[PDB]
Amino acid sequence: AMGSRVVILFTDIEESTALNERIGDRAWVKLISSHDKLVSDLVRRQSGHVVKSQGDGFMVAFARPEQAVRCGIELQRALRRNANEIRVRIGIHMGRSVRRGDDLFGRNVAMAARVAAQAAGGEILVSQPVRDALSRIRFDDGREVELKGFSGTYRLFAVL
Amino acid sequence: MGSRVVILFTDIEESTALNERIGDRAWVKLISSHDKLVSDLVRRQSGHVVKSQGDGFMVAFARPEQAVRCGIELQRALRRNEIRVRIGIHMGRSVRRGDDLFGRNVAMAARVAAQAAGGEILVSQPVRDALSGIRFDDGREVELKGFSGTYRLFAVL
Ligand SMILES: [Ca+2]
Ligand SMILES: [Ca+2]
């Protein structure tokens, strides 16, 4: 089979451009640097690696889905603690994808990005394969969506 | 808010549908050759690829004519070859740290590219004004997400 199994987590900040415009570039560079360090550290704690990041978005790879979910939960908790300003959406999907360079390519990379794009600020959504892989962490009963660039319907599950 | 820089974004129109159509094997081959093409052409105009992810590139140039020429050669090259790519170009101060670019003008460049049609090179008004060899349309006025008001964007003819 083409490619290797990987669990891909995408995250990005809700309305980051408006935030940047509000607080100005000096404050934004500090904010996004602090955020990057936060994400990086929490990823490393779950034996993940940040594959790509640009602006307010990150693509992260894990070997096991429980690591990816644990990382998301800790990130959302950490962001809530900080707020006591920044909300992030998190999406997780797993499947085979092709490593080329220090990037990942293939339909399951794109799918992971769409699972994330479906998530509200403050929310962690996972694809059905992730939910099913973790069925033995708690999930809602899912909602049915259609993902940009893909035919058919997909059920996405919120982490509780 | 950092050094003056010209920022070019490009990305493939509906790459996901494309991937699903030809399959991963074919897609990885396609995007690998596309990456080679873009990298080649950027270097030809003294640009520097700052970030690339999936079907997209963020590119830095010193001068707006370099960015526009690069965009023109890339569209021409792609025609000689199906994929359509959006190209957007903006200029302004951006913070350049750790081999990356930060700030509102990076976001603005991405918004300009996102407004471009496949096969189009769209530039912001500061880029058009700096180039006053290169011909533009009369512009179109649009809202860009995250920014207040409207912006006039100009296609390269
Ligand atoms: Ca965002
Ligand atoms: Ca695209």
Side-chain angles (χ1 to χ4, degrees), chain A residues 1-4 6-25 27-29 31-43 46-48 50-53 55-69 71-80 82-98 101-135 137-147 149-160, chain B residues 2-3 5-35 37-43 45-52 54-78 81 83 85-134 136-144 146-151 153-157:
Chain A
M2 189 65 116
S4 291
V6 64
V7 180
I8 300 180
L9 181 153
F10 275 93
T11 176
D12 79 89
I13 294 167
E14 172 172 52
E15 294 286 352
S16 71
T17 303
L19 176 60
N20 188 347
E21 278 294 86
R22 210 140 67 235
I23 70 177
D25 277 355
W28 168 255
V29 174
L31 184 158
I32 198 69
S33 296
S34 167
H35 187 64
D36 177 285
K37 181 61 164 46
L38 176 64
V39 171
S40 177
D41 293 349
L42 294 179
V43 166
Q46 304 294 342
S47 309
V50 181
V51 186
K52 289 286 182 182
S53 66
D56 69 306
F58 296 83
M59 186 181 66
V60 188
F62 301 83
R64 298 169 53 258
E66 47 259 71
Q67 297 169 322
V69 173
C71 175
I73 292 169
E74 290 303 335
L75 177 53
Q76 296 288 13
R77 284 177 182 163
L79 291 173
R80 284 194 290 275
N82 288 353
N84 288 315
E85 170 69 343
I86 298 164
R87 306 206 320 175
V88 308
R89 61 187 69 89
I90 304 184
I92 308 164
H93 176 57
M94 64 187 236
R96 293 189 184 260
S97 47
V98 176
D102 299 319
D103 203 351
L104 296 170
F105 294 99
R107 52 105 64 197
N108 285 312
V109 186
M111 183 165 285
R114 296 323 300 170
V115 173
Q118 285 288 333
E123 177 178 53
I124 307 169
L125 289 184
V126 313
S127 63
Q128 182 125 36
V130 173
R131 176 265 195 145
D132 288 337
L134 296 173
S135 69
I137 301 174
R138 298 295 176 267
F139 301 94
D140 67 3
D141 289 324
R143 66 176 173 96
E144 220 165 61
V145 311
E146 297 182 35
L147 302 173
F150 298 97
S151 66
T153 67
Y154 293 84
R155 195 168 197 86
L156 307 183
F157 301 83
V159 177
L160 309 178
Chain B
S3 301
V5 63
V6 183
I7 308 172
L8 178 151
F9 274 91
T10 177
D11 78 302
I12 299 176
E13 183 173 50
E14 294 172 352
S15 70
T16 311
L18 179 56
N19 190 168
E20 280 289 273
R21 203 182 315 138
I22 64 183
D24 278 358
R25 183 194 284 86
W27 163 247
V28 172
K29 179 171 178 175
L30 182 152
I31 192 64
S32 298
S33 60
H34 181 71
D35 165 90
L37 173 63
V38 174
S39 293
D40 177 35
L41 291 172
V42 162
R43 294 195 176 110
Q45 305 303 336
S46 308
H48 187 255
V49 179
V50 178
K51 293 237 152 170
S52 53
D55 69 320
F57 300 83
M58 181 182 73
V59 192
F61 299 86
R63 290 165 27 219
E65 57 264 39
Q66 293 166 324
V68 169
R69 288 169 191 165
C70 178
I72 291 172
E73 291 192 6
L74 176 56
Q75 296 289 12
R76 188 176 288 109
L78 289 172
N81 300 337
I83 70 162
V85 312
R86 302 188 191 83
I87 303 174
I89 306 169
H90 177 52
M91 67 192 304
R93 289 185 180 279
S94 172
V95 163
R96 186 135 178 199
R97 182 166 86 201
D99 299 317
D100 203 353
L101 290 168
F102 301 86
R104 70 140 244 160
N105 283 321
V106 178
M108 173 65 68
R111 295 298 196 239
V112 175
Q115 295 284 328
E120 189 173 49
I121 305 152
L122 215 52
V123 315
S124 65
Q125 186 167 327
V127 179
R128 184 204 65 160
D129 286 354
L131 293 175
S132 71
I134 300 172
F136 300 93
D137 64 10
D138 295 343
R140 64 185 185 257
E141 193 172 323
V142 298
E143 293 176 66
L144 303 174
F147 296 101
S148 61
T150 63
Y151 295 87
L153 308 180
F154 297 83
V156 178
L157 298 174

